[PDB]
Amino acid sequence: KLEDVVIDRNLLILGKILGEGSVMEGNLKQEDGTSLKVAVKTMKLDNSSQIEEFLSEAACMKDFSHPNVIRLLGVCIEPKPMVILPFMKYGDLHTYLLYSRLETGPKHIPLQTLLKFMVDIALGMEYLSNRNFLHRDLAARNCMLRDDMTVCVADFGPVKWIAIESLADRVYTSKSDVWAFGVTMWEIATRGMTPYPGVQNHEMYDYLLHGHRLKQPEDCLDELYEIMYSCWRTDPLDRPTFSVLRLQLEKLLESLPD
Ligand SMILES: N[C@H]1CCCCNc2nc(ncc2C(=O)NCc2ccc(F)cc2)NCCCCCCNC1=O
Ligand SMILES: [Cl-]
Numbered sequence: 001k002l003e004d005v006v007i008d009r010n011l012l013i014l015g016k017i018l019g020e021g022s023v024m025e026g027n028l029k030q031e032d033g034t035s036l037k038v039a040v041k042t043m044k045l046d047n048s049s050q051i052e053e054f055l056s057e058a059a060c061m062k063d064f065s066h067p068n069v070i071r072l073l074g075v076c077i078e079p080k081p082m083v084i085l086p087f088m089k090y091g092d093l094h095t096y097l098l099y100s101r102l103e104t105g106p107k108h109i110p111l112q113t114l115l116k117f118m119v120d121i122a123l124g125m126e127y128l129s130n131r132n133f134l135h136r137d138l139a140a141r142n143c144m145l146r147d148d149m150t151v152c153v154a155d156f157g158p159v160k161w162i163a164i165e166s167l168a169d170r171v172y173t174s175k176s177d178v179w180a181f182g183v184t185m186w187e188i189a190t191r192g193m194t195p196y197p198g199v200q201n202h203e204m205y206d207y208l209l210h211g212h213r214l215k216q217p218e219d220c221l222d223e224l225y226e227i228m229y230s231c232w233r234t235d236p237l238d239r240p241t242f243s244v245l246r247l248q249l250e251k252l253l254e255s256l257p258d
């Protein structure tokens, strides 16, 4: 119970809603006297039982220090647990991807940059997988852009992102995350398309059971599509690890000009 992970509610000031569960901007008064801009995620919970069993991961998650993994700053209570995260003015990668297809928004994202996004995420997931942390919700909307434009994975602790074995059952290995990473790669390569156009979410298990997979995008290198298709092999054992994927993508990026 020695959890120097909780933060006194009084050190926290809450502002506008950034998204809806419900996410609000905030200011965190830090221990050096300065205030930090934060994002505050309201985790609506069932307090029939036990609020606890929730400060467990958060204390492990606070021990995470990888630049491609969002940092947990701590948790506050109002009984309303609030998860305190850094604020990233550039927002989530999915939206950045769409914006980039509008004038005024980011310029067309070249492939090198798109791949560097996939490497960041692969690096972040590799860190988490080496500490046997499952994500269970990986998608471009839950990846965030840091002020230096490196990507970090977030919302650790959806139908079209769920591996096929996890639809029949509801079990999740890290190889189920690998599958979602492959979908996320497709999200990135398509500059934000929704997965499986023409297929409804109710059609998805039968779609996948008959071995249909996400189609290859128009400009996507054959080599990148092979990497992403490997994430969807029917046997989780045939899928690569995140450490294999991360090096594959790093190599392909290096095999491209600047
Ligand atoms: N709802 C989904 C995805 C989006 C998460 C909510 N958005 C933000 N949160 C973050 N910080 C900045 C933003 C933001 O929206 N930046 C734009 C802005 C510019 C300028 C400005 F003035 C205000 C906001 N950190 C928390 C990240 C992860 C929390 C939940 C996981 N992901 C979700 O649950
Ligand atoms: Cl407040």
Ligand SMILES: [Cl-]
Pocket: 192, 193, 194
């Ligand atoms: Cl689209």
Ligand SMILES: [Cl-]
Pocket: 195, 196, 197, 213, 214, 215
């Ligand atoms: Cl498709």
